[PDB]
Amino acid sequence: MLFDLRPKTRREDIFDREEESRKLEESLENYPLTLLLGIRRVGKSSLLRAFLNERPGILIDCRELYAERGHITREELIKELQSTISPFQKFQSKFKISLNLKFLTLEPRKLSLREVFRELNDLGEELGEFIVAFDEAQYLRFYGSRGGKELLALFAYAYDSLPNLKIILTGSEVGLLHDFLKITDYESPLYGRIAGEVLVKPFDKDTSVEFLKRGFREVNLDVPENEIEEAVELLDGIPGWLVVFGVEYLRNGDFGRAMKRTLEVAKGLIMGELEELRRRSPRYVDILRAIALGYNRWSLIRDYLAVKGTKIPEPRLYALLENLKKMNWIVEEDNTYKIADPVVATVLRI
Ligand SMILES: Nc1ncnc2c1ncn2[C@@H]1O[C@H](COP(=O)(O)OP(=O)(O)O)[C@@H](O)[C@H]1O
Ligand SMILES: [Mg+2]
């Protein structure tokens, strides 16, 4: 069912995304390397898991690799490749593969990334294609001690020399992903190499309404039209929040209490991420709150914060806002800043 908090892993469990799935297939057909891009909670992991459900591939969670030590080593990455494709006999049974993988017998300490990728390409040769997906690949900048350059080199090698191997990199922090890859810097191993781009956006109004409608239909619940309209006006096409709301409504039976609880859950998660930002600079959260309150132009932001205590120099303010954009907290459009996720804005206004 739609209104369920467990991870979605199959195509029949994903509402719409039929254009996005086709565009992902098309990108794989056209380029060795594909970027899957969009706001956090928009549905990238879910789409990717459903896509790999039918197509031989592995998904590596780069954020989960970074989380523990704030750093990723070769051994850890390799151990994760090993465990994600295991038990390999299950894989061979599902996709009917006769080939065995040597690197699975070997200790991560004594394997190279290139060795592993060559074996996966050999597997691709039998199948047609093998997919390696890095979820939130911008965290690979915390790999090694050279800013993850060994991964860029590995990707350049796959691009040029492993034709039965396709790589998907996803990122919620889109600008930060583009920064890591550096495809226009001559120093980058990926220089001049073109990647496909598949963009995952929030549902439109009518799709959001239909999403909620389907969710309630599945449990024979009829929810008045105006309550679904009101939920979409507050929750604006973000499937992550639409599912939390659907769950809370099934549990609570009331628009007010379901939305109150949805906002509680959102507040908790967003506050956790705002903690992370606040450590880097308290300024980030100050700027975010200002924008959420309607101080959404340069001078509006600058005067507001000066008045609340902190005068931010113009070069600093520019850098801070640019970073916020690259992290995708914020969009700048028509000479105006906005919080990328309207629920984040709701939480920042308290
Ligand atoms: N197309 C969809 N259909 C149904 N539920 C979805 C869809 N996309 C996302 N979800 C729900 O929203 C949550 C957030 O999606 P996720 O794929 O984790 O976002 P992202 O990877 O973009 O941060 C998922 O756990 C699932 O609850
Ligand atoms: Mg994700």
In this structure, the number of other CB atoms found within 10 A of the CB of residue 232 comes to 22
Cα(335)–Cα(340) distance, integer angstroms: 15
- Domain end: 280, 298, 328, which one? 280
C-alpha radius of gyration, the chain, whole number = 22
Residues followed by a break in the chain (C to N exceeding 2.5 Å) are none
Judge if the upstream peptide bond of residue 163 is cis by omega within 30 degrees of 0. Answer: no
Whether residue 120 contacts residue 45, with contact meaning beta carbons closer than 8 Å, is answered with no
Q: What CATH number is associated with residue 262?
A: 1.10.8.60
256 by DSSP, 3-state: which? helix
Last residue of a domain, one of 230, 261, 280: 280
Tokens encoding 215:
């969710």
Q: Are 252 and 258 in contact (CB under 8 A)?
A: yes
For residues 108 and 6, membership in a common domain is answered with: yes
Q: How far apart are CA 342 and CA 349, in angstroms?
A: 11
Ligand 1 atom with the shortest distance to the CA of 39 = 22
Report residue 66 as tokens.
């970074």
The number of the ligand 1 atom at minimal distance from the alpha carbon of 14 is 3
Q: Are residues 212 and 140 in the same domain?
A: no
Tell me the residue ranges of DSSP E strands in the chain. Answer: 33-37, 57-61, 130-135, 165-171, 196-199, 330-333, 336-339
> Which of 34, 47, 55, 26 lies closest to 166, judged by CA?
34
| CATH number of the domain residue 346 falls in | 1.10.10.10
Q: CA 56, CA 47: separation in Å to the nearest integer?
A: 15
Same domain assignment for residues 246 and 194: no
Technique used: X-ray
**Cβ atoms of 166 and 201 closer than 8 Å:** no
Measured in Å, residue 37 CA sits from the centre of ligand 1 at: 13
Instruction: Kindly state the DSSP code that residue 6 receives in the 8-state scheme.
Output: S
218 and 274 co-located in one domain: yes
Q: What is d(CA 149, CA 165) in angstroms, rounded to the nearest whole number? A: 20
116 and 191 share a domain? yes
Resolution in A, one decimal? 2.2
The domain total for the chain is 3
Hey, whose CA ends up nearest to atom 13 of ligand 1? 240
Q: Which residues line ligand 1 (CB under 6 A)?
A: 2, 7-8, 14-15, 17, 38, 40-46, 172, 239-240, 243
Look at the alpha carbons of 269, 270, 271, 277 in this order and tell me if their dihedral is positive or negative: positive
Atom of ligand 1 nearest to the CA of 243: 27
- The Cα 254–Cα 260 span in angstroms is 10
SS3 183: coil
Choosing from 46, 59, 201 the residue with most ligand 1 atoms within 8 A of its CB, the one to mutate for a pocket test is 46
Round to whole Å and give the CA distance between 326 and 177: 8
Assigned token pair, 322? 């640019």
State which ligand 1 atom lies nearest to the alpha carbon of 136. Answer: 21
How many whole angstroms separate alpha carbon 71 and alpha carbon 146? 12
Q: Cβ distance 286 to 305 under 8 Å? A: yes
Full domain range(s) for residue 347: 281-350
How many A from CA of 338 to the centre of ligand 1? 22
Q: 276 and 288: one domain?
A: no
CA 310 – CA 289 distance, rounded (Å): 14
* Closest-approaching ligand to the CA atom of 207: 1
Q: Give the position of tokens 């093998």.
A: 130
User: Is 86 known as a binding-site position?
Assistant: no
SS (H, E, C) 94-157: HHCCCCCCHHHCCCHHHCCHHHHHHHHHHHHHHHCCEEEEEECHHHHHHECCCCCHHHHHHHHH
Three-class secondary structure of residue 72 per DSSP? strand
- Looking at residue 59, its amino acid is L
7 and 67 both lie in a single domain = yes
CA distance 63 to 296: 30
Return d(Cα 10, Cα 106) in angstroms, integer.
31
List phi, psi (to 5°) of 296: -125, 20
